[PDB]
Amino acid sequence: MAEEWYFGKITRRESERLLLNPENPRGTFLVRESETTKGAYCLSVSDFDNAKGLNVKHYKIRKLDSGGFYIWSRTQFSSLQQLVAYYSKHADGLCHRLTNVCPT
């Protein structure tokens, strides 16, 4: 049992398959393990614009030796739960604020 938004070892294309479901509104997200970087995580979030329609953006979450996490070094967090809590309040760099936890 992990956090509701933690999807573990799912692939980048599987995260897109789940997030691109038309029933999921803009701002739907999940956190997963990175396929490209060992020890890093990815925040995958759905967005919408006039050119692309519903699309997915992926953000790399790096873990520090001190135990912290960040997407941009200017804003660091002590846990993944603090990171999700912050980005649920302000977009601050992301395409959209986190609003809906990806189902199933």
Side-chain angles (χ1 to χ4, degrees):
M1 188 281 288
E3 299 293 309
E4 60 186 316
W5 37 255
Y6 193 79
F7 279 62
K9 297 185 189 66
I10 61 160
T11 62
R12 181 176 176 119
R13 67 187 174 285
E14 176 68 358
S15 71
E16 293 181 336
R17 184 186 72 86
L18 297 173
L19 294 171
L20 288 169
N21 188 312
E23 283 196 55
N24 296 150
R26 177 179 178 177
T28 297
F29 73 102
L30 59 87
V31 174
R32 58 183 174 85
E33 278 195 19
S34 177
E35 286 192 279
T36 53
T37 314
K38 282 282 187 175
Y41 297 94
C42 302
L43 172 61
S44 297
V45 53
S46 71
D47 197 25
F48 186 92
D49 65 78
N50 198 51
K52 289 184 174 183
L54 199 69
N55 67 97
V56 179
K57 285 281 180 172
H58 301 277
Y59 299 89
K60 185 101 70 193
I61 301 166
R62 301 273 170 172
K63 188 174 182 175
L64 292 157
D65 296 315
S66 56
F69 293 97
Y70 67 97
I71 294 168
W72 293 278
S73 78
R74 64 154 39 218
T75 309
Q76 299 170 24
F77 310 91
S78 56
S79 64
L80 285 178
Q81 22 285 106
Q82 200 206 320
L83 182 143
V84 168
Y86 180 85
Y87 289 113
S88 291
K89 295 275 183 181
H90 337 89
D92 199 37
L94 302 183
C95 58
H96 195 95
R97 49 175 302 251
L98 306 186
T99 53
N100 307 276
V101 169
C102 189
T104 54

